[PDB]
TrEMBL record, chain A:
Keywords: Ribonucleoprotein, Ribosomal protein. The lineage of its organism: Eukaryota, Fungi, Dikarya, Ascomycota, Pezizomycotina. GO terms for cellular component: ribonucleoprotein complex; ribosome. The chain holds residues 23 to 110 of 110 of the full protein. One of its GO terms (biological process) is translation. This is 60S ribosomal protein L36. Belongs to the eukaryotic ribosomal protein eL36 family. Residues 1-20 have a biased composition (Basic residues).
Automatic annotation (TrEMBL), chain C:
Component of the pre-66S ribosomal particle. Involved in the biogenesis of the 60S ribosomal subunit. Belongs to the NOP16 family. It is found in: Nucleus, Nucleolus. The chain holds residues 126 to 235 of 237 of the full protein. It comes from Chaetomium thermophilum (strain DSM 1495 / CBS 144.50 / IMI 039719) (Thermochaetoides thermophila). This is Nucleolar protein 16.
UniProtKB/TrEMBL annotation, chain E:
The lineage of its organism: Eukaryota, Fungi, Dikarya, Ascomycota, Pezizomycotina. This is Brix domain-containing protein. It comes from the Eukaryota. Belongs to the BRX1 family. It comes from Chaetomium thermophilum (strain DSM 1495 / CBS 144.50 / IMI 039719). It is found in: Nucleus, Nucleolus.
UniProtKB/TrEMBL annotation, chain G:
This is ATP-dependent RNA helicase. Coiled coil: none annotated. The chain holds residues 111 to 542 of 556 of the full protein. It is found in: Nucleus, Nucleolus. Its main location: nucleus. Belongs to the DEAD box helicase family. DDX18/HAS1 subfamily. One of its GO terms (cellular component) is nucleolus. The keyword RNA-binding applies. Residues 32-207 form the Helicase ATP-binding domain. Associates in the nucleolus with the 60S and pre-60S ribosomal subunits. It comes from Chaetomium thermophilum (strain DSM 1495 / CBS 144.50 / IMI 039719).
Amino acid sequence: GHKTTRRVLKERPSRRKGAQSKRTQFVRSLIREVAGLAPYERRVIELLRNGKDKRARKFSKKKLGTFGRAKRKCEELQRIIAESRRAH
Amino acid sequence: EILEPFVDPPRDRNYRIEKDANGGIRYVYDEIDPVYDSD
Amino acid sequence: SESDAVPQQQQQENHIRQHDLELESKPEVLRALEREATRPVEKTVRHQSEREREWLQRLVDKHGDDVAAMARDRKLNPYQQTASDIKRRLKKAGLL
Amino acid sequence: KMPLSAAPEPKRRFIPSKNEAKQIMKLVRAIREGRILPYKPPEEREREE
Amino acid sequence: DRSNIIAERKNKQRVLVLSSRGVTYRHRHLLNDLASMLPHGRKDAKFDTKSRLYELCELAELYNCNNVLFFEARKGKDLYMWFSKVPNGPTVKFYAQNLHTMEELHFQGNCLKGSRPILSFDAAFEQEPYLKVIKEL
Amino acid sequence: GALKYLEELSKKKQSDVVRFLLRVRCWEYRQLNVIHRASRPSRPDKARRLGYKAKQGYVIYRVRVRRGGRQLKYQRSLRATAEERVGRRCSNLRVLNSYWVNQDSTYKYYEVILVDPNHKAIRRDPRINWICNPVHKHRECRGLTSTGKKSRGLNKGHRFNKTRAGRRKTWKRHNTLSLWRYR
Amino acid sequence: QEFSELNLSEKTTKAIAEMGFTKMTEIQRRAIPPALAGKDVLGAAKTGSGKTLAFLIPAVEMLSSLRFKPRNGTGAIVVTPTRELALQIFGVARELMKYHSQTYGVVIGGANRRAEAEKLGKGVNLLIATPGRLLDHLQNTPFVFKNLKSLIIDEADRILEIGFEDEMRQIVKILPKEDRQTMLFSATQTTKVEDLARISLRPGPLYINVDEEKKYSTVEGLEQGYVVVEADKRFLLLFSFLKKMAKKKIIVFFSSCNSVKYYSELLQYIDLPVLDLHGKQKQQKRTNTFFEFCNAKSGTLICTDVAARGLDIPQVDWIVQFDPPDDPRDYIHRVGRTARGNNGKGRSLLFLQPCELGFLAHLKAAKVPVVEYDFPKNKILNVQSQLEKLISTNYYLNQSAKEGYRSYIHAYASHSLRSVFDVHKLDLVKVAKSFGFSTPPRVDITLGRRAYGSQPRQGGRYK
RNA sequence: CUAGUAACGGCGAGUGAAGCGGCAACAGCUCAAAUUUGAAAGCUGGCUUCGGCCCGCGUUGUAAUUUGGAGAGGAUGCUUU
């Protein structure tokens, strides 16, 4: 509508209120190994180690409630499988 | 076997390359068969 | 002229003074308020402690004017202060 | 192999303590007002008592 | 042979019936009433709006489906319908205007469930290529 | 330091370590009294982020609450019932906050951080002595804790139109016939 | 022609007078008057002629004449290949704007991205940048670059050699073009340099040639000595060398200015007298120090290899390359020729770790005779415990050690010969022990299938 | 005032807001997630000749610093009690 000269704004410190911090990633990874897995996470990991990815995604979706949360959990457990094989 | 004495030595696809209707790039993936899963 | 289209260049007259402003017929109360706001005041210049003067004195008695050597000195300057800070403290003490 | 924090180390970890300096100056002010008793080495306290 | 079709030549067709997040009671009722007519259709709901559009093909790959019928809802009032062949086929986006579901109590008729329906097209469904693509979808 | 790790651990409550520890503690709490004094918080990260301090005048109290419906559902939260029962046992204390610590098949266990308003360590601290004022007498009974703030719908937005300033005050404002002098 | 002849501003004249420069080279005298007239400049000068002032005088004059402010963003952008060249130009620009109210800043790959983002958001009038980080800040950070009037591209042959071709293509595409004066410099003239001059500069350039035609790059009359030393003892060996080759002339080359400053303070405390040439001092101090070293019977001068690239190297007994060379071809040929000398032959020693020995294979391919220098283990003066106590107790030396360690790691990471010098093969604990640390400080070494049903995007706006 | 509007409803009885706009009044802050680590620097009690002495709480964290349209650490030079 009306013409005004747009400004470039100062970078918001509230932007990315999640974590790009390496220390929180370190703490999250260490706790995962120390604590272990949930029973449903162990079932998903035993399906993923057998190559049954479709069943794993359906089980995760059923027990989490969203396809995005299921995808994120399946990627996390696949990453855990990858580092476990690398350590093996 | 390096040829130039002081330079750095030079150094699972699921789609198909097909021309689209407009003339750019179109990707053709593996077709889905409607076979019912065991689960 | 406005070489760069700046809306603020007509407004002019990165650190500013923080604790005050630098501001540059009528009713009698207004004139009295200006007079009492414009009258000169004292400053109460902050002095230095005896131990700080002794520290700056001992620092001068060994190096004289080499403020870089005084900063390097670990024995006589335990808090490893920068030569600029010690020079400022010497200037405030009048020990140059 | 490296620390997790890349933050700088504060200068306070390389210079003598400032809290103890304030405490010692408070004690010096207390001795000068005679409020507290000065230092006597323990053998003096043993031979006095 | 797990095709679940017993015939001479099999018409392997599977539909994935899906609804968005902000659907209404009317849109949900239309979803339930339309998915009841399709035996080869699977019902799921609450697809994530912020997610990409092609992720619907990944959701269909999970259920071995080659058709998706998407119920996109905008503002909690507007219904858009997506008819798409999943791997590489065309997509038809539609807007649904006036809805009258099966729960409406004035219709006085009813039919079986999975009875192979006679698909009655219009004569404009061959005299225009876009209506031909819609017709075949 | 360690509280970041404990927060990340508390976020995995079905993992082996946390599941094992929760079951052993649930067994012990089941065989204790319904409302019993806890020497220290079992979840120090959670208590610390809710305002608990290891200072004289701060008290933890563990409480078990029978879970389930009251098909009439109790519009009061089980966490609110916990704070009210503890607030009556410790009628000289002010309920600061509370948090979930455990759950069983028939009970849900919560820990309530309380504050003594008559201790001199609390009355001298400007960060907590607001609770010494008599307007904070029995905050759990008037919906003034966290559960009370959630159950009363005290949020900003169009979704909370009838409850953001009080439901009954809004209803009284909308049902009042205002007649001015010049009509 | 002298610097007082042109009608520069009085602030710029005073700054150049303080530097001590009263006479120009050919490239300054032939580039500054046309560039002050607003004409784009194509150059053929090498490193060390004085091209830095030749592109910094018109930028400073433009910034002062248009009265730029920190709220106006970038006015001039100087793109450099490496971070140490950018830091040298930043030191020169800091000396040039001593009286100018305009701001100046550096943006280099390997530094803090968030601190650089805040620096760019506050407003940097003259921006000396590295292409990858400049492109990253131009694409993902909010800062004002709409008032750009000067784009200087410096040493374009090296930037096209490293592989920043597509980065500069996107940089020129992003940057505003109308009323922008472009000045591009390159010591050679390739097809990629011609392509860059075609996309960047306007249809009418001005082509200026200041280059010696008699380059003596013969591959037979040379002899390069090397010493194989592990990382954790490297400096110790140098210290022993610098205490055993006293009463001699030694030039030592380091990769960064920060490590030169750290080792200067370190050798001041560890009672070994040296002379330092790093880009954090006054130009006058540096010229006087180099003049004093050039007219001395003995002594050792420590400096950066890129800082002494444009320096008249005198007759010295030893030329030591302590850090990896930035330009290995230039190092071998030209630095070996300046090490051999006009009179009785000096020697050029190179410090090699036992993970960069493939350089020797390169010396096998170039047919350059090599000489191996070994050292006894018992003749190394072990001052490691004193060094660690000094680093642990002195806050200024700890800061300098951290800065030198970070600068060494980043310069090693941004290396042209990544096969010979790879940061991933470096043991950070040992090199930090060489710098004087018990534990290595934290640094960043670095700094399938397409989606099912996904067809390429054909519309929409992404910011 | 919006406004008996939107919205919901044996779409009957009816029920029934909110943003903007004008006004009254206006005021902003405290923690948790950091190692004070070159010095628990913090606090409740008791004894008092009232000035400073003991026991205890507390390191499973009491002071100071910081609260994301922020902040810290160094450097820097002015300005404040």
